[PDB]
Design a protein around this ligand. Structure first.
Ligand SMILES: Nc1ncnc2c1ncn2[C@@H]1O[C@H](COP(=O)(O)OP(=O)(O)OP(=O)(O)O)[C@@H](O)[C@H]1O
Ligand SMILES: Nc1ncnc2c1ncn2[C@@H]1O[C@H](COP(=O)(O)OP(=O)(O)O)[C@@H](O)[C@H]1O
Ligand SMILES: Nc1ncnc2c1ncn2[C@@H]1O[C@H](COP(=O)(O)OP(=O)(O)O)[C@@H](O)[C@H]1O
Lengths: 370, 75, 370, 370
């Protein structure tokens, strides 16, 4: 009996260890109302969380507590974890030990303060923080190979060979789902359809998930988009109003492969995956090309795998065979790994206990992280 | 001044600028290392009359004809 | 054609026209179409069903005001064509549009359909030699005569902050919010009804804009002025009747700096300025804080510069020099910039010729914009 | 030749240029090509798409930085051509390349293709009378005015140790390691992200280099200073914001002494020096240990001399006299050596003439360099 709780910037995936898929999946947001001095009606919650805030988007200002895999407002994150254990999962945190997930190369204060809350506020019996990328490999039953776990908050590239990780080869890029969502708003505003508010940004994320797809040749796709209106698809908003996004459909996910569009002055998700493999030892490169995994929900874009293969193959040597690993459950790839890890009898020892936390302090986490 | 006097919707008796109040080697002094004073004029004089023999010179990774020592002698 | 180019500012509230030779705009009239309020069947009433600028101001109470441009976007194009036709009337300028070339001043990050249709009208309806669409922010710097400078241009329709350093505008650091002078006029009408004076009519909305422009001061501390008993300064209406404004005077334009009070999800005028600087690169931040320029009519509020300086200082880093350099001609700054730009021989290269638009295509106007 | 020969110290971090005989290099500017990343909209902005040296330093925030040479190997030659062109331009020495001979200063044990291309550019693109390529270490000894000494030259790009006894330099005892000042700045950036301050931008990476030079001390005992709670020393960024560096201050420069931290299997700077002496013949070991000369900018770290003297003493034999001598101008020591060598009449014989290069080709340069 143990709890796996993925603390993703976009969506918080929580559930019991051993189960196939996560029990409760809700958007990680806190909804505070745009209140005036006028008195409010009955059935009023001071701050709404998750699926409740997703229902009452109209009035509530949606504030994401985790920004680029860094917890900015801890009071907000506490209210999400309270919604996770007590309401969503229907379980006491004192009974079950809780596994959390942190992105690699995050600030040290993040892991420090995270565990402090779990030990003091919720009074958990044991707490282990893990790297999202390390878990994602277990999903595919692969010990060897690199992963390109692109989330809503961040995208990170962690090469692991024969159950041994290369820490110095790890590269983090701040370009992620929320930056693409923010980019899609700007180009939709250029077409005509203006989306400004926090509630409207959530509707633009629903537009992104459904329509947007990765093009094989961007320049070739822009030529077809100009000539014919075949790529132009219609989407119905919450309001009866319908919109035809056009070429901006495949223009949004292009930003992943060339950040110049967003204006970050950084390497693309294809180029960073190559650079990470080159930073590793020369011998093991072979297996990393052969076992390139794509994880998170930012790798569920239709035809990212085809475009990824093409771009890596061009950069990589001709003799090498480049196979991209795209399992059907990419969105729940971080959690399903956690469920496999927590269930294993070996992992029982690796848990950090309250007694261990009390004596040493919150600094113990940095030793027993990975 | 007379240009802006002509127009109706102009700022009159307002300050133009709103501004804030105007607010007004450790290794090179180490014990371990011995601090030398570089005098190129002195250095130039010491090497002044020193020459090199560029005849039969080959520093390259050429195997032929045993070992070689570049810059044979002066004068 | 060598004949003098005609600058025209597309201000949502007031459009400012004139020749490039003039130091100031000779002809500037309100941007609204005036039709008779009662649907005219009979003779002896207001004839034509069109009253623009000074003719409208004379017979204002009889007519019904309808603004053609909202939030820096043209809603009714038929109305805008009549307005631009009145610019080339016997009343203002008194010239052929076919002879003189034109310069438009569209707000930043507007819809591309707005720019394309604006060009189509000015090339097809009027037989213009050449047209050039430009950004309102870039012009404001030419007027003042400095290359570096952030331009907080608070218009009637839109308030936007564009950072430009050494003649280089960062397009990602641009910030645009819809809460502008027109919204302040709308919110003042609500507070005037809370004082007990209704301005229900579209004509009666114009005198609320006059009340705002005459008497509305921005308090340095809003909470202290609320507790203090007001003088209740009397304003005289067109009919002759007096109205005591009282606390509505100062707590109306406050909604610029704090738009959450009414319940509008926006950043605020102090916030968009700071955010635009913070979004830009770290090296430039100090110089961009050291060079801020106020543009448009919604900066002329009494004690705007005093409040903004205080609200920017607390958000901005400590011990940083913040100079908010307002010109004396803030309302007419955007046009004067265009008048200088138009006069230069470089402008001859920048604009798009009528024959160029026929051959090149639609993109011609967009690609030459920058 | 009557015209003085120009000394150019082609350093990875800073390229130092000047005329032979001069006591100090008159014109020393940072080695990078700055291109504007933001768009030009206004007229009168900064002219050219290439900014090099002091103009690039002033307008750093506007530009995207790109180092042409990495680890003493010219990666992009087009860029290296533009910086050498800028040395001869009006801003720096302001003379024709055809009239003055050149003295280039490359690092030891660099690729042969680098020396070949370096010559090709300096003879074809610039029609120079004569070029001599020399080692950095050999010059550093002429500056101090000593015939016997080992030269530990820790530069920005590469750190190397060359044992030189009574004029002769032992080519098999040369020790070179890629880990250097620029890897310390790269390793500092990684630890600053762990502390929770991000510097993703190429312009922001130059601020990390500024933080390194100002606030980073090498602790005499590494394991001792790790455990003890450190005083969190605040540093002021260009914008004004304060960062607490904390443990990253002293952990960052330790990379030079322990290359295992970044994860490269190479010798430490302390191991490089002793290995270079131990590789030399038995008789000269005592004289080389007595005569140690530190060079390059990366030796200017606070407590470098103290730590190195501690580390060398443990690896070196018992009861041997270890005197580490520092010239006050460590940074400019390499160039001053070049000026003294260039001023001697013996340098005339050492040169490769244009005709000599044109006849034999690449071989002539490889024959006469060390
Ligand atoms: N099918 C899809 N196609 C395209 N984009 C998607 C799709 N599903 C989700 N996304 C986008 O990618 C993000 C994926 O978030 P996800 O559910 O993987 O959680 P997360 O916060 O990224 O967690 P983690 O970092 O642990 O992977 C969403 O926020 C959304 O913006
Ligand atoms: N003297 C003034 N005091 C206060 N508000 C003013 C004043 N003059 C104009 N305004 C406000 O500013 C608006 C004018 O905006 P304007 O500068 O013409 O915008 P644009 O830059 O788009 O042309 C008016 O409609 C009014 O709301
Ligand atoms: N005061 C300082 N403290 C620490 N490191 C420094 C200091 N000054 C310069 N450096 C480092 O030394 C570098 C300069 O290298 P330099 O000696 O000019 O190279 P080269 O010897 O290859 O010509 C800088 O880029 C920086 O990384």
């Amino acid at each position: 009996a143990a709890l796996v709780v993925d603390n993703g910037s976009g969506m918080c995936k929580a559930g019991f260890a051993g189960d196939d898929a996560p029990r409760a999946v809700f958007p990680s947001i806190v909804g505070r109302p745009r209140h005036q001095g006028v008195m409010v009606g009955m059935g009023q919650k001071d701050s709404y969380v998750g699926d409740e805030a997703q229902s009452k988007r109209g009035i509530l200002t949606l504030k994401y507590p985790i920004e680029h895999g860094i917890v900015t407002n801890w009071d907000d994150m506490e209210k999400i974890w309270h919604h996770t254990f007590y309401n969503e999962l229907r379980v006491a945190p004192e009974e079950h030990p809780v596994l959390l997930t942190e992105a690699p190369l995050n600030p040290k204060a993040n892991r420090e303060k995270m565990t402090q809350i779990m030990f003091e506020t919720f009074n958990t019996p044991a707490m282990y923080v893990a790297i999202q990328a390390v878990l994602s490999l277990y999903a595919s039953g692969r010990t060897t190979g690199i992963v390109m776990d692109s989330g809503d908050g961040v995208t990170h590239t962690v090469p692991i060979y024969e159950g041994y990780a290369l820490p110095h080869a790890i590269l983090r890029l701040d370009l992620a789902g929320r930056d693409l969502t923010d980019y899609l708003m700007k180009i939709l505003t250029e077409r005509g359809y203006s989306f400004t508010t926090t509630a409207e940004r959530e509707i633009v994320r629903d537009i992104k998930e459904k329509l947007c797809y990765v093009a094989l040749d961007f320049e070739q796709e822009m030529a077809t988009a100009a000539s014919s209106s075949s790529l132009e698809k219609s989407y119905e908003l919450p309001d009866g109003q319908v919109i035809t996004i056009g070429n901006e459909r495949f223009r949004c996910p292009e930003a992943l492969f060339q950040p110049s569009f967003l204006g970050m002055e950084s390497c693309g998700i294809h180029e960073t995956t190559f650079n990470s493999i080159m930073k590793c030892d020369v011998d093991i490169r072979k297996d990393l090309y052969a076992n390139t995994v794509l994880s998170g929900g930012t790798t569920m874009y239709p035809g990212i795998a085809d475009r990824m293969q093409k771009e890596i193959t061009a950069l990589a040597p001709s003799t090498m065979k480049i196979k991209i690993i795209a399992p059907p459950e990419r969105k729940y790839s971080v959690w399903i790994g956690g469920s496999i890890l927590a269930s294993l009898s070996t992992f029982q020892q690796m848990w950090i206990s309250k007694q261990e936390y009390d004596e040493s302090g919150p600094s113990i986490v940095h030793r027993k992280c990975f | 001044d007379p240009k802006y006097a002509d127009l109706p919707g102009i700022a009159r008796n307002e300050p133009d600028v709103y501004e804030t109040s105007d607010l007004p080697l450790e290794e090179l002094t180490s014990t371990s290392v011995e601090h030398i004073i570089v005098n190129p004029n002195a250095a130039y004089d010491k090497f002044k009359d020193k020459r090199v023999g560029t005849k039969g010179l080959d520093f390259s990774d050429r195997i032929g004809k045993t070992k070689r020592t570049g810059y044979e002698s002066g004068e | 054609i060598a004949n003098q180019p005609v600058v025209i500012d597309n201000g949502s509230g007031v459009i400012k026209a004139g020749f490039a030779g003039d130091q100031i705009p000779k002809y500037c009239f309100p941007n609204y179409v005036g039709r008779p309020k009662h649907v005219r069947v009979m003779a002896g009433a207001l004839e034509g069903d069109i009253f623009i600028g000074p003719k409208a101001e004379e017979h204002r109470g009889l007519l019904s005001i309808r603004y053609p441009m909202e939030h820096g976007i043209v809603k009714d194009w038929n109305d805008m064509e009549r307005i631009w036709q009145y610019v080339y009337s016997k009343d203002q300028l008194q010239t052929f549009s076919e002879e003189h070339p034109v310069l438009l001043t569209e707000a930043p990050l507007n819809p591309r359909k707005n720019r394309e249709r604006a060009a189509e009208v000015f090339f097809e309806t009027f037989n213009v030699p050449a047209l050039f669409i430009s950004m309102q922010a870039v012009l404001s710097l030419y007027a003042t005569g400095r290359t570096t400078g952030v331009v907080l241009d608070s218009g009637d329709g839109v308030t936007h902050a564009v950072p430009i350093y050494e003649g280089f505008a960062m397009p990602h650091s641009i910030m645009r919010i819809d809460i502008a002078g027109r919204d302040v006029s709308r919110f003042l009408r609500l507070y005037l009804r809370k004082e007990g004076y209704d301005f229900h009519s579209s004509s009666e909305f114009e005198i609320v804009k006059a009340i705002k422009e005459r008497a509305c001061y921005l308090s340095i501390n809003p909470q202290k002025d609320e507790t203090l008993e007001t003088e209740k300064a009397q304003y005289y209406l067109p009919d002759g009747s007096t109205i005591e404004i009282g606390p509505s005077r100062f707590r109306a334009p406050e909604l610029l700096f704090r738009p959450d009070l009414i319940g509008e999800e926006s950043e605020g005028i102090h916030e968009v300025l700071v955010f635009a600087i913070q979004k830009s690169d770290m090296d430039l931040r100090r110089t961009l804080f050291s060079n801020i320029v106020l543009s448009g009519g919604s900066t002329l509020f009494k004690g705007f510069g005093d409040r903004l300086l205080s609200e920017v200082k607390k958000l901005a880093p400590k011990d940083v020099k913040i100079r908010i350099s307002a010109p004396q001609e803030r309302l007419y700054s955007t046009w004067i910039g265009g008048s200088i730009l138009a006069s230069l021989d470089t402008f001859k290269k920048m604009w798009v010729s009528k024959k160029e638009y026929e051959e090149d295509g639609a993109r011609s106007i967009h690609r030459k914009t920058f």
